[PDB]
Ligand binder design. Structure first.
Ligand SMILES: [Mg+2]
Ligand SMILES: [Mg+2]
Ligand SMILES: [Mg+2]
Length: 105
RNA sequence: GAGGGCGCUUACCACUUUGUGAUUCAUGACUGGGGUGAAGUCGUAACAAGGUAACCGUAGGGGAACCUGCGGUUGGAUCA
């Protein structure tokens, strides 16, 4: 409760119980998520509010309220896990491989 | 004179000092695991004969669930 300013920002990472949300200027600010969120991935623009600092200048978390529409999505299914999206909202993929341990085709 | 007092000295001994142990609390870089986490990643181990029957003890292996070797049990199916 007692949330802050609704704004657009880019999610840095995903940690299940919470997520790292970068603001519109480059501020690392971790936030938890809304219970109605079906999925949240790395690099997804969201609607979020950075809570309210209890101590003056020292805040713990904010919340991520809403999720914008997807440009792309990387959904890969799995046995006994179902279809799970990994990443989204991307234009280019770079397949990176090495000769060690193996280089398969 | 007898005797007493003072003073001195000795015995006992508190506090106090050094050397060096035992024990206890607080602090403590670092470090060992474990628990609590529905949505995160990695795999599909076990529960059906769960797709190499499982489990226990022990040794070795490797991100990991685990696997292999030896021995035992049925808390195993199908089987005469
Ligand atoms: Mg299995
Ligand atoms: Mg099995
Ligand atoms: Mg056996």
């Amino acid at each position: 409760n007692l949330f802050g300013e609704p704004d657009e920002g880019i999610v840095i990472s995903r940690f299940g119980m919470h997520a790292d949300v970068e603001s519109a200027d480059g501020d690392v600010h971790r936030c938890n998520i809304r219970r109605t969120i079906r999925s949240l991935v790395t690099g997804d623009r969201v609607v979020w509010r950075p809570g309210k600092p209890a101590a003056e200048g020292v805040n713990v978390k904010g919340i991520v309220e809403a999720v914008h529409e997807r440009t792309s999505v990387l959904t890969r299914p799995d046995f006994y896990d179902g279809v799970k999206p990994i990443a989204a909202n991307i234009d280019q993929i770079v397949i990176v491989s090495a000769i060690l341990p193996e280089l398969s085709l």
